[PDB]
Design a protein around this ligand. Structure first.
Ligand SMILES: [Ca+2]
Lengths: 274, 51
């Protein structure tokens, strides 16, 4: 009755879970369209909303709920299983039910996460241009010891053009591209110098409102695999700095090809958490 | 596709592609509508899905 989505064994999160490290006491903020807290396969312990007229613990889009289940779907007899199923999960609503938002809303979310002692931020989101406010917020969060993870973008490739979006393109943020279940790069996955690692982003099964499940594509789906991997590493090694967690993830990744298209390759959290 | 509220520069990064009149695949409705306002109204929708 519980399904293990393919991304869990692909990144070797099952191997780390078997050692007993499942993300307990690690605080992960999902900056997104909210999370359906009443989902049977998710526990949301806190959060905040920066979208007027929307609560933090609901999700009228579904995207934030999907992202959250990749990180943290509960280990039980139903639904799916997260990368780090014992994580303390915080819904930080920075996008409305249409799945869009202002950069001021994202900055508010990053600031909340930094102030409230989050260990990991996931941002399965991006825009085409930077803002200095956004850069200041992610730079500060990383400097204060938050592991900041974001989807690299779904702009594909076009010759030698850099298609990484923001905040993934900032050097304080881990830009995560997408592979599929054969470990091949998804055609939509953004490319460029700032691409850091890959994770599963094609045909990813996870939680979805209301009380159901869905299969979605995007670097949005890859990012939470890495945020969850960071949480597993910290549950095993609680005294690591954010840069130590980040370097473990990139230095132990499985090389797939040219760094322009794959960064350092597919994360291997078993190797990263050694 | 309704682009009335745009620009709204932050978008989810779910891939649900649209193909523009510029022969570029936009990752989702939000990415497309932000590109329309930057265009400035020159970009239109060819069809849903990849180009
Ligand atoms: Ca479950």
């Amino acid at each position: 009755a519980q399904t293990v989505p393919y991304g869990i064994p692909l990144i070797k999160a099952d191997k780390v879970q078997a050692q007993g490290f499942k993300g307990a006491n690690v605080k992960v903020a999902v900056l997104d369209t909210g999370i359906q807290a009443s989902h049977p396969d998710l526990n949301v312990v806190g959060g905040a909303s920066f979208v007027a007229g929307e609560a933090y613990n609901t999700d009228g889009n579904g995207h934030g709920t999907h992202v959250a289940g990749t990180v943290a779907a509960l280990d039980n007899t139903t639904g799916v299983l997260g990368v780090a199923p014992s994580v303390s999960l915080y819904a930080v609503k920075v996008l409305n039910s249409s799945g869009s938002g202002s950069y001021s809303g994202i900055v508010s979310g990053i600031e909340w996460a930094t102030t409230n002692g989050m260990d990991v931020i996931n941002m399965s989101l991006g825009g085409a241009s930077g803002s200095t406010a956004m850069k200041q917020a992610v730079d500060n969060a990383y400097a204060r010891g938050v592991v900041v993870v974001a989807a690299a973008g779904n702009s594909g490739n076009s010759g030698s053009t850099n298609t990484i979006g923001y905040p993934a393109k900032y050097d304080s943020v881990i830009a995560v591209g997408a592979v599929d279940s054969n470990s091949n790069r998804a055609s939509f996955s953004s490319v460029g110098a700032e691409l850091e690692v890959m994770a599963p982003g094609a045909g990813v099964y996870s939680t979805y409102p209301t009380n159901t499940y869905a299969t979605l594509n995007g670097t949005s789906m890859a990012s939470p695999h890495v945020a969850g991997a960071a949480a597993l590493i910290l549950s095993k090694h609680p005294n690591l700095s954010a840069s130590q967690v980040r370097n473990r993830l990139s230095s132990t990744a499985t090389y797939l090809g040219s760094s322009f298209y794959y960064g350092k390759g597919l994360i291997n959290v078993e190797a990263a958490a050694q | 596709v309704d682009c009335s509220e745009y620009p709204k520069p932050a978008c989810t990064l779910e891939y649900r592609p649209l193909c523009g009149s510029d022969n570029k695949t936009y990752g989702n409705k939000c990415n497309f509508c932000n590109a329309v306002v930057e265009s400035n109204g020159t970009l239109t929708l060819s069809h849903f899905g990849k180009c």
